[PDB]
Design a protein around this ligand. Structure first.
Ligand SMILES: CCC[C@H](CC(=O)O)N1C(=O)c2c(C)nc3ccccc3c2C1=O
Ligand SMILES: CCC[C@H](CC(=O)O)N1C(=O)c2c(C)nc3ccccc3c2C1=O
Ligand SMILES: CCC[C@H](CC(=O)O)N1C(=O)c2c(C)nc3ccccc3c2C1=O
Ligand SMILES: CCC[C@H](CC(=O)O)N1C(=O)c2c(C)nc3ccccc3c2C1=O
Ligand SMILES: CCC[C@H](CC(=O)O)N1C(=O)c2c(C)nc3ccccc3c2C1=O
Ligand SMILES: CCC[C@H](CC(=O)O)N1C(=O)c2c(C)nc3ccccc3c2C1=O
Lengths: 531, 531
């Protein structure tokens, strides 16, 4: 079936949309060539629709069936509970989209009688009606990127499809305890979301070093959510039902599967019908867990189809990396083509063909890669980095505007050991905090979980806990990493590293002069700048 | 050992304390004899200390050992997870006492870097140190009562003993998923906290009707928290460890048991050492679960000791009711004395001797009892009520002052079908909301779980969900119930029911005239008043 059917009504916005980088004193100081940075809007939605809309063919084989049996066996050892309305409310994110039924996320979290009575009514209805498709909203995402002048400049907006807030809370009642424990048990060390950046590095490096002649590749599925079939979503449901669950959870999980997860009608922000979905909804509770299980299942089967030797997989939703024993150059090339044909048969055809890699540094998984540097004693230290283009573009945007989502601080935390986060992001933002006397003021931050209220002065302690103390003394980065940062600085028109080291030497100076916790920041975050 | 040892430092307050009922237009309209209503303060703490301080002797027998084996067998089927720091933070109550380490409950719930970093540090310390007693604070509670002129007028303040906010969050990480699932599995239908008021009534009534000649009794332990021994708290720990838990949870549960739950030093609000505890702390996560398991264990053993026939127990923390088959009047009297001697040997000696009862209405459990009335069709409807004295006294207090804890609204919800909640509390408070134009304004409310933000206009829908529609049409209440309400109105100087019906007829009139949701309130909440 077609992943989507459309009526012709437009995907519409709910507010003014900016496509152009606010141009400037502070932001220009970071990034000069401002026309390379753009944001997506509803205007490009029409073209994303084209991309994500296609027929799916799916032919399963016994490799798939065997793997699914194994997964169900592990699932059968899992016990999970229903969350009460009140638990599900307290676990609702603070900025999540309001209900059309007259309450918002703050009401949910504060256990408002209105939200609570409503959610209670949605839950009854899930149990008593296992049929009627549940409404969803479709919207174009507003995200910031750099032009990719040579994979068209601007990409169109990605789409998000979500049910009403009331339903989202009921999803947690039925499934929060399942999605938060089940993939771990089924997939073990292949379950990517159990790892901090450092633990991800440890797994990848140990996996890589364990092969005599390692080969690895990332596998990029073309529009993964769109490739997920009805059968895939029912298979997911059958894995959930292998768990030892409460009677009401089983009923609600079945009902959510039938009425919401398999598909349903799509409504724009103006209330008209945009069309119909028969693939993964991007904005449900089970998006991540479901994509993970489904990717793992298809990929494990395809590894067997391709007869790849001593395969180790790491899966984060639609994001897949495999590391195996090389059979030789041409052998690997052939086996990866066979892997890809199996994935394609399972309804997960690729964006660009996967390529075998023989250098761990060149494998990008979750937009990141392992690199190496050395600490103060001279020992090799592996760490997670990424291409700094999107982080820098977004940091420039956030220098122009206020935001709950100032990604710059999340990037500083998650990528604290990197050359670019240390020399550029820390320097740039601490310069601004100092000048504006906002060093002590808490800022909202989306980490790859909740929303945190982070005091900048807590950064040394956060980084120490997450990265360890070597984060404050890494030196002698790889030539590939340095190259990539250098080319990105040129591309975007960021001042060279000379100009950052330098500027940081002055930032370190305010900080140390301020004494106290500000001096601790100068001391640990900027020890690289002095000597 | 002694339940407590004291140094002589005083239990001190953290703010001005009122003992006397604010005297008045609105509150006087509800309750005239204002000197009968008082609140407890730190000044009476010295005398509570005397009461809760005693040596415990405990001699276990094979009835106890057999029951414990059975409980452990059931516990062994339970699986439970660690909560992340972030989950435990989101489940922290909004008004919980701030940390001495520079953050409050709002910081915890908003995932502040300061709270988060701190809690992370407390958790490490729990895992790495299983020895050093953890500090606790002791405070006198401020609670409102009526004078009991014939069980001395005023009781002294109850005491609460709690660790720091950081530790309380770690308690949830280790044990939230255990305390929220384990007692249910071990104790089944005897676990009182699984029931709404109505489901509690259903269990009690069906249990009572299932005996040929029913007898029941409540058992009131003298200062239950004080009777809980070191061995009791280690037995609790051994039941927790029967669960299939994560390695870190096991370690933290052991460590919390050693450093906190078994005992430790007591510190007043001024920071000095008040003494040392060797019994149950009243303000830990495991207080309710622990008291429930321990009460159930001791009581089940004592039932066997006393050879009570076809026993059914209902347990809510320290609160215990048993319903069994009568062996005859003098036989029952003797068996209850033997039950009491067994409980006493197990270190749970009684306040007043338990008395056998042959009328379900006269058994008070959790300050409440089952009664009967009839609905609009004339069918018998069982419901939960209680002596209205404390609810009325507290409602009068809350008419004098603002409060997050306006118990009046919680009492209206939980006791919506009662004669007194309907005629007096609903009438009184809706009269005030109407006059002050605050009908649409949300109010904070502690139900016997979280803190709710309740819009008064949602009451009809809340009551319907919890009680059913018969709540709005109960008639022909029991003569015992009517008697008790009548005597309480005389005692406290509340206007007679004539004066309430009457006044409600006018309240119903504003409401219906207002139209909309206010009219729905007039229609359902006050249908008793018109006809
Ligand atoms: C110069 C016009 C830029 C605007 C800004 C925006 O994104 O809203 N812009 C479009 O109007 C637009 C359309 C209609 N389709 C696109 C398809 C792919 C990529 C970009 C598109 C843009 C676009 O950038
Ligand atoms: C040239 C590659 C196509 C991409 C997608 N693409 C654009 O980058 C783009 C822009 C910047 N503006 C547009 C305006 C109208 C229609 C399409 C546009 C596109 C576009 O398709
Ligand atoms: C995080 C930056 C500290 C290190 C350590 C060092 O001083 O060697 N550091 C670099 O790695 C580095 C590089 C690769 N290029 C630079 C160019 C100009 C000025 C400083 C540079 C630094 C640098 O300080
Ligand atoms: C008339 C004085 C009433 C005060 C008010 C209060 O409770 O703080 N009051 C006491 O001072 C007091 C003391 C010292 N001990 C008590 C012991 C038992 C019950 C009441 C006590 C009160 C008391 O009410
Ligand atoms: C007479 C019964 C003793 C109770 C307990 N009791 C009181 O009610 C009381 C009051 C009201 N004031 C006190 C003041 C000082 C000391 C004891 C007090 C008590 C008291 O013990
Ligand atoms: C919740 C009150 C409604 C009922 C129903 C009825 O009208 O019979 N109701 C009483 O039960 C009741 C009693 C016991 N005493 C009263 C005394 C004076 C006025 C009304 C009374 C009511 C009453 O309305």
């Amino acid at each position: 079936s077609m992943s989507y059917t459309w009526t012709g009504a437009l995907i519409t916005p709910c507010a003014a949309e900016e496509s152009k980088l606010p141009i400037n004193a502070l932001s220009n100081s970071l990034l000069r060539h401002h026309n390379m940075v753009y944001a997506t809007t509803s205007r490009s939605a029409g073209l994303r629709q084209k991309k994500v809309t296609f027929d799916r063919l799916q032919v399963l084989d016994d490799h798939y069936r065997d793997v699914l049996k194994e997964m169900k066996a592990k699932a059968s050892t899992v016990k999970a509970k229903l969350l009460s309305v009140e638990e599900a409310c307290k676990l609702t994110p603070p900025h999540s989209a309001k209900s059309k039924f007259g309450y918002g996320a703050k009401d949910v979290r504060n256990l408002s009688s209105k939200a609570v009575n409503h959610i209670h009514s949605v839950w009854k209805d899930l149990l008593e009606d296992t049929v009627t498709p549940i409404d969803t909203t479709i919207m174009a995402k507003n995200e910031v990127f750099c032009v990719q002048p040579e994979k068209g400049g601007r990409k169109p907006a990605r789409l998000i499809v979500f049910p009403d807030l009331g339903v989202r809370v009921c999803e947690k009642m039925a499934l929060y305890d399942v999605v938060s424990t089940l993939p771990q048990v089924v997939m073990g060390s292949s379950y990517g979301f159990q790892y901090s950046p450092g633990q991800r590095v440890e797994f990848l490096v140990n996996t890589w070093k364990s092969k005599k002649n390692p080969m690895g590749f990332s596998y990029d599925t073309r529009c993964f959510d769109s490739t997920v079939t009805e059968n895939d979503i029912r298979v997911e449901e059958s894995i959930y039902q292998c768990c030892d669950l409460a009677p009401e959870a089983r009923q609600a999980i079945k009902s959510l599967t039938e009425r919401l997860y398999i598909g349903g009608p799509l409504t724009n922000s103006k209330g008209q019908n945009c069309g119909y979905r028969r693939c993964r909804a991007s904005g449900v509770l089970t998006t991540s867990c479901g994509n993970t299980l489904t990717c793992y299942l298809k990929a494990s089967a395809a590894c067997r189809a391709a007869k790849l030797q001593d395969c180790t997989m790491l899966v984060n939703g639609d994001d897949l990396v495999v590391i195996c024993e090389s059979a030789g150059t041409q052998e690997d090339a052939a086996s990866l083509r066979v892997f890809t044909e199996a994935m394609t048969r399972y309804s997960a055809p690729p964006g660009d063909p996967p390529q075998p890699e023989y250098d761990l540094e060149l494998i990008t998984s979750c937009s990141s890669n392992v690199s190496v540097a050395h600490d103060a004693s001279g020992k090799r230290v592996y760490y997670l980095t990424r291409d700094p283009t999107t982080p820098l573009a977004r940091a420039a945007w956030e220098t122009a505007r206020h935001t709950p989502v100032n990604s710059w601080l999340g990037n500083i935390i998650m990528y604290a050991p990197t050359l670019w986060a240390r020399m550029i992001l820390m320097t740039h933002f601490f310069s601004i905090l100092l000048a504006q006397e906002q060093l002590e003021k808490a800022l909202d931050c989306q980490i790859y979980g909740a929303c945190y209220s982070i005091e900048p002065l807590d950064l040394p302690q956060i980084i120490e806990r997450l990265h360890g103390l070597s984060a404050f003394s890494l030196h002698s980065y790889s030539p590939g990493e340095i190259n990539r940062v250098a080319s990105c600085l040129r591309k975007l028109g960021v001042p060279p590293l000379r100009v950052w080291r330098h500027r940081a030497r002055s930032v370190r100076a305010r900080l140390l002069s301020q004494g106290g916790r500000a001096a601790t920041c100068g001391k640990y975050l900027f020890n690289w700048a002095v000597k």
